[PDB]
C-alpha cells in the first residue's frame, strides 16, 4: 500500500501533523477487486476519506461493523493460532485507515478492545466458534458502550434542565441533540441557541433536528457568541475525548467558547461516555490534532474568491484545524453514565475499568 | 409518627452532631423494627429518613441517611437471608457508631499540626470541628489569636467567642460585613461544613462563600475542617442551584472547590479531588 | 555481622557531614540496597520485629538528614512492600472500608525471600524511570517551540536530549544565583546543539513573554502535589502561572513523600552564608543577616502536568499515588 501524498504547504508550527486532500484518495494505486486490504476496509476508507461518515460514534460503529465483517470473512491459515493470526492481519488495516483519515479516541478505544479481545482467545476454541462470539462481543460493546451509555446520560442531564433555561449547544453531536429530544419530550419547556462555525457547517444538522422536534431554536455564527450569552442559561457542549489531565478535547470552536462563557458567569457542561476517555494528556492543540483539507477555507463573497489560487503566493499559509483541547478549571460540570461526576474525577473513571 | 421525639431526645448531648443522633436513632429503629423482608426494611427506613430530614433541615441529616441507606444495600449482598444480614448490620452499625465517634479527635490531632505560633486564624461560625482543633493546639504549647464573624442570621459567632475565652485563647468578634475589612491581618481560614458535594466543595453558613473568595483574592488558604459521614452526592452548578429545603433568608450556601485548599477528615489530610474519588468507590 | 553496623554508620556520617551520592537515583539504590542487606543479615521471627527494625533505621536515617527525603521514601516503600507479603501469606482507609468492615506477630520462612525478590523488582524499575520520562519527549515538545529550565536536572537534561533528536527548539537555561548549575546543563545541551541560552533568575520574568513551555523538575514532591524544588523556582512558577505558560515536571516515582506542608522552619536547607555574601567584606559582617536557603517551596495549583515513569498525570491526581505506595501508619515513621 503506497503511503498517501501531502497537499500544499503546511504551517511551521503544524508541520509535524499530515495534510491531505479530499479531491486525491489511494484508491487509485490499488485493485478494483482488494485483495492486501479487505474490501469492507476499503470502502470504510473511501467513506472516511470523502467525508460521508464525519462523527465520532458514528466512525466507531462503522469501524466495529467492518470488523464484524472482516472477522466473518476471516479464515485462520494452517499451522497458524487466530489469537495472533487475527490481530498481526487486523494491523495493516488499521494502518490503511490511518492513512485514509487520522482515527478518533473511540476508535482508538475500540481498537484496543477489540485486540485484548482476540488476544483472549483460548487455544482449543473452535474457529466458528470464536468468531461467533468476537462477533457477540463487538455486539455487546456497542449496545453497552454507546446505546445504553446514552440513556444514562439522557437522564442524568434531565435534572439539570429547568423552565425557562436558554440551553447553548455547538456544532454537531449525537448525545447533545438526544438529551434535548428527550428532555423536550419528558416536559421540560426551554430553547436552544445552536452555534456554528466554518467550513463543516455542521451545527445545521443540529438546528434542523430540533425544529423537527418542535424545540424553539434559535441559529447564529460563533464570533457572535459574546453578544447571545448574556441571555443563555447554561452552555451544553458534546467531548471527542476526555484526557487523563481533566483537559477536554473536542471541536476546535470549543476550548474559545468555554472560555467566553466563563466572562459571563454561564456554567458550562461536557457530555461524553467513559468509553471514550484517554489515558494519554494533552496541554495544548499544537502537539496532536488534525489538519484537513485547505482548500475548504475558500469562500465566494460577492463575485470573487479571494483565496482562489493561494497556492501562487510563495508565504501564504492556510491553516485549517480540526481539534481543540479545554483546560480543566474551564469546565464546570461533566455527565457520564455513572452518574454526574466532576473534570478532575477522569482517571479515577480510568482506574475503576 | 412519634420517631422524632426519640431523635430531639437523642441530643441531649450538646456536643453531639445531628447526623450522628439521626444515625443512632436509624439504628434503634432498625433495631426495634419487626419486619421480616429487606424491601420493607428499606421503606420504613427511607419514610424514616425522610420523615427526620422534615424537622431537620441541615444538609448532614441527609448526608448521614444515603450513607446509612448506602451501608444497608452493601450489608445485604453478602448473605441474602435478613436474620444473618440483621445481625451483620446490627454489628456493623455499632462499629460504625463507635468509629465515628473518634472523628472529631482524629480531625484534631491531625490538622493542629498547620497553625503556626503566633499566627492569627479566621472562622465564621460556631462549629465543634474547629473548637476542638483549636483546643488541640493550645494544648500542644502554641500562642495564637482568632478573629470570629458574627454570623448575624443567628449569633454564633459569640458563642465559639465565649468558649475560645473560656479556653484561655485571644479572640476579637469581627462584623460580617467587616470580613473583607480583617482577611489582610489573617494567616489562614478554618471553617467548619454541614456537607461537602461531589466536585469537592462545601455547603456551609451564608457567609462563608464570599469569605473564600476574599481569601482567593488574597492569596489566604482557606482551610476547611468536616467529618466523613457529610459527603453527598450533589453538584450545585451555582447559588441557586442548591436545594430550597436545605437553604431554609438564606441559612445555608455553597462554596466552590477552587476556593478550598484542603480538606480534614476522619480519612485524613484530602484535596477537593479526593472527595468524588470516595463517593465513587462507595457506589452511592 | 558488625560489617552492615559499619555500613549503616559510614552511610549515616555520610549523609550527615556532607553529599554522598549525587544524584538521587544512586541514593535510593544505596537506601534499597541497604535495607535488604538489613533484611538479610538480621534475625526476625516475625514481621513486627523486622518492621520496627526498618522503622528505626529510616528514623535514624531522617534523622541525619531531613531534607533526604529519597531514604525515607525508600524505606516507607520496603515497609509497605514487608507488608503486602505478609498480607498475602497470611490470608487504606475509605468510605467502603468504613462501612463494610491485625498484628504482625505470625512467622513464615519463605516470608523473607519473598520480600528479597519483591526488592529485587523495585530495584530494576530504577533503571527504567530516567528513561522512561525520557521517552515521553515527543509527547510533549514540538519543533520551533521554546522552552525554559531552571538549574540541573538530569531527567530534565535527557528529556530535552532525547527531544532534539528527531526534533529542534529553543532551550533557556537561568542559572541559580547560590548555586550556578545551570552553567553545566547549558553546556552539556550545547554540546548536543539544540541553541542553548544562558540567563539569570532576575531576567526569568523579563524573557517569561517569549516562552511556550516551561520543564523543570524537583528534589521531591509532596502529598497534596506541591514541590519542594531548588531556590527561585517558585518565581518561576509565578511568572509561569502570569502568562499562563503550562508548567511540566519531570520526576520518577521514588520522590513521592506523604508529608504535607506543615513542617515549616526545616522545609528549606541553609547553607552558609559564603556563597550569597563573601567572608572578605569586612566589618559589616556583624552587623548583616545573611540567609542562603536551598530549597523551596512550590504550591501545587502553579504547576500543570507531572511526567514519571507510568506517564503523565495531573497533580489533584497524586493523592492517589501516595496511596498506592505508602501505609497510613507509616506517614510519620
Not at chain 1, 440513556?151 to 435534572?159: D, K, L, P, T, W
Not at chain 1, 449547544?169 to 445552536?194: K, M
Not at chain 2, 481569601?215 to 457529610?230: D, M
Amino acid at each position: 500500500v503506497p503511503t498517501r501524498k501531502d497537499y500544499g504547504s503546511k504551517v511551521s508550527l503544524f508541520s509535524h501533523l499530515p495534510q491531505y486532500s479530499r479531491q486525491n484518495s489511494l484508491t487509485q494505486f490499488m485493485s478494483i477487486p482488494s485483495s492486501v486490504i479487505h474490501p469492507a476496509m476499503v470502502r470504510l476508507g473511501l467513506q472516511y476519506s470523502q467525508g460521508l461518515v464525519s462523527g465520532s460514534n458514528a466512525r466507531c460503529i462503522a469501524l466495529l461493523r467492518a470488523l464484524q465483517q472482516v472477522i466473518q470473512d476471516y479464515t485462520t491459515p494452517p499451522n497458524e493460532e487466530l489469537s495472533r493470526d487475527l490481530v498481526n492481519k487486523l494491523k495493516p488495516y488499521m494502518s490503511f485507515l490511518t492513512q485514509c483519515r487520522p482515527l478518533s479516541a473511540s476508535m482508538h478505544n475500540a481498537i484496543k478492545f477489540l485486540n485484548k479481545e482476540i488476544t483472549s482467545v483460548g487455544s482449543s476454541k473452535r474457529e466458528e466458534e470464536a468468531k461467533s462470539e468476537l462477533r457477540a462481543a463487538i455486539d455487546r460493546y456497542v449496545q453497552e458502550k454507546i446505546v445504553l451509555a446514552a440513556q444514562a446520560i439522557s437522564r442524568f442531564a434531565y435534572q439539570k434542565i429547568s423552565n425557562g433555561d436558554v440551553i447553548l449547544v455547538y456544532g454537531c453531536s449525537s448525545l447533545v441533540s438526544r438529551i434535548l429530544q428527550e428532555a423536550w419530550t419528558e416536559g421540560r419547556r426551554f430553547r436552544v441557541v445552536v452555534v456554528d462555525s466554518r467550513p463543516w457547517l455542521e451545527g445545521r444538522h443540529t438546528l434542523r433536528s430540533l425544529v423537527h422536534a418542535g424545540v424553539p431554536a434559535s441559529y447564529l455564527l460563533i464570533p457572535a457568541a459574546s453578544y447571545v450569552l448574556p441571555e443563555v442559561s447554561k452552555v451544553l457542549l458534546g467531548a471527542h475525548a476526555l484526557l487523563a489531565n481533566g483537559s477536554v478535547m473536542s471541536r476546535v470552536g470549543t476550548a474559545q467558547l468555554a472560555l467566553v462563557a466563563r466572562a459571563h458567569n454561564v456554567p458550562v457542561l461536557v457530555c461524553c461516555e467513559t468509553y471514550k476517555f484517554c489515558e494519554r494528556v494533552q496541554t495544548d492543540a499544537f502537539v496532536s490534532n488534525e489538519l484537513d483539507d485547505p482548500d475548504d477555507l475558500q469562500c465566494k463573497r460577492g463575485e470573487h474568491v479571494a483565496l482562489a489560487n493561494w497556492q501562487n503566493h510563495a508565504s501564504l499559509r492556510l491553516l485549517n484545524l480540526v481539534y481543540d483541547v479545554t483546560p480543566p478549571e474551564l469546565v464546570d460540570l461533566v455527565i457520564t453514565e455513572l452518574g454526574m461526576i466532576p473534570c478532575s474525577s477522569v482517571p479515577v473513571v480510568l482506574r475503576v475499568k | 409518627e412519634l420517631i422524632e421525639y426519640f431523635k430531639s431526645q437523642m441530643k441531649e448531648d450538646p456536643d453531639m452532631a445531628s447526623a450522628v443522633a439521626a444515625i443512632r436513632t436509624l439504628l434503634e429503629f432498625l433495631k426495634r423494627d419487626k419486619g421480616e423482608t429487606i424491601q420493607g426494611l428499606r421503606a420504613n427506613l427511607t419514610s424514616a429518613i425522610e420523615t427526620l430530614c422534615g424537622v431537620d433541615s441541615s444538609v448532614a441529616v441527609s448526608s448521614g441517611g444515603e450513607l446509612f441507606l448506602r451501608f444497608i444495600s452493601l450489608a445485604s449482598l453478602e448473605y441474602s437471608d435478613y436474620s444473618k444480614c440483621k445481625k451483620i448490620m446490627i454489628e456493623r452499625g455499632e462499629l460504625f457508631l463507635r468509629r465515628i465517634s473518634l472523628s472529631r479527635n482524629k480531625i484534631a490531632d491531625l490538622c493542629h499540626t498547620f497553625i503556626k505560633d503566633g499566627a492569627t486564624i479566621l472562622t465564621h461560625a460556631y462549629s465543634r470541628v474547629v473548637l476542638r482543633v483549636l483546643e488541640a493546639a493550645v494544648a500542644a504549647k502554641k500562642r495564637f489569636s482568632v478573629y470570629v464573624t458574627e454570623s448575624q442570621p443567628d449569633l454564633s459567632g459569640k458563642k465559639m467567642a465565649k468558649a475560645l475565652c473560656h479556653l484561655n485563647v485571644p479572640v476579637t468578634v469581627v462584623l460580617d460585613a467587616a470580613v473583607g475589612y480583617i482577611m489582610e491581618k489573617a494567616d489562614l481560614v478554618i471553617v467548619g461544613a454541614e456537607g461537602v458535594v461531589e466536585n469537592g466543595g462545601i455547603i456551609n453558613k451564608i457567609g462563608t462563600n464570599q469569605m473564600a473568595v476574599c481569601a482567593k483574592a488574597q492569596n489566604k488558604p482557606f482551610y476547611v475542617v468536616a467529618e466523613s459521614f457529610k459527603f453527598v452526592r450533589l453538584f450545585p452548578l451555582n447559588q441557586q442551584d442548591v436545594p430550597d429545603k436545605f437553604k431554609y433568608h438564606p441559612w445555608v450556601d455553597y462554596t466552590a472547590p477552587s476556593l478550598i485548599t484542603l480538606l480534614f477528615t476522619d480519612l485524613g489530610v484530602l484535596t477537593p479531588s479526593a472527595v468524588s474519588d470516595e463517593l465513587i468507590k462507595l457506589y452511592l | 555481622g558488625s560489617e552492615l553496623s559499619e555500613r549503616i554508620e559510614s552511610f549515616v556520617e555520610t549523609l550527615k557531614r556532607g553529599g554522598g551520592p549525587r544524584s538521587s537515583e544512586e541514593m535510593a539504590r544505596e537506601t534499597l540496597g541497604l535495607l535488604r542487606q538489613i533484611i538479610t543479615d538480621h534475625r526476625w521471627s516475625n514481621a513486627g520485629e523486622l518492621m520496627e527494625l526498618i522503622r528505626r533505621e529510616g528514623r535514624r536515617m531522617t534523622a541525619a538528614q531531613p531534607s533526604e527525603t529519597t531514604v525515607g521514601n525508600m524505606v516507607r516503600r520496603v515497609l509497605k512492600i514487608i507488608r503486602e507479603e505478609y498480607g498475602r501469606l497470611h490470608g487504606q482507609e475509605s468510605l467502603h472500608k468504613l462501612l463494610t468492615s491485625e498484628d504482625f506477630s505470625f512467622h513464615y520462612a519463605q516470608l523473607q525471600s519473598n520480600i528479597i525478590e519483591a526488592i529485587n523488582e523495585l530495584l530494576v524499575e530504577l533503571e527504567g524511570t530516567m528513561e522512561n520520562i525520557a521517552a515521553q519527549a515527543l509527547e510533549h515538545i514540538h519543533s520551533n517551540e521554546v522552552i525554559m529550565t531552571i538549574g540541573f536536572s538530569r531527567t530534565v537534561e535527557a528529556f530535552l536530549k532525547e527531544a532534539a533528536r528527531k526534533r529542534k527548539f529553543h532551550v533557556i537555561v537561568a542559572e541559580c544565583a547560590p548555586f550556578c548549575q545551570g552553567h553545566e546543563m547549558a553546556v552539556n545541551l550545547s554540546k548536543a546543539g539544540i541553541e542553548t541560552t544562558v540567563m539569570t533568575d532576575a531576567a526569568i520574568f523579563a524573557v517569561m513573554s517569549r516562552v511556550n513551555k516551561v520543564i523543570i523538575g524537583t528534589k521531591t514532591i509532596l502529598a497534596n502535589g506541591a514541590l519542594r524544588a531548588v531556590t527561585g523556582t517558585h518565581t518561576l512558577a509565578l511568572a509561569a502561572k502570569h502568562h499562563s505558560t503550562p508548567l511540566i515536571v519531570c520526576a520518577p516515582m521514588f520522590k513521592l513523600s506523604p508529608q504535607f506542608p506543615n513542617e515549616e522552619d526545616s522545609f528549606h536547607k541553609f547553607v552558609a552564608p559564603e556563597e550569597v555574601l563573601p567572608f572578605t567584606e569586612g566589618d559589616i559582617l556583624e552587623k548583616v543577616s545573611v540567609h542562603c536557603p536551598v530549597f523551596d517551596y512550590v504550591p501545587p495549583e502553579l504547576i500543570t502536568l507531572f511526567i514519571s515513569n507510568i506517564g503523565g498525570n495531573a497533580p489533584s491526581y497524586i493523592y492517589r499515588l501516595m496511596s498506592e505506595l505508602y501505609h497510613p501508619d507509616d506517614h510519620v515513621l
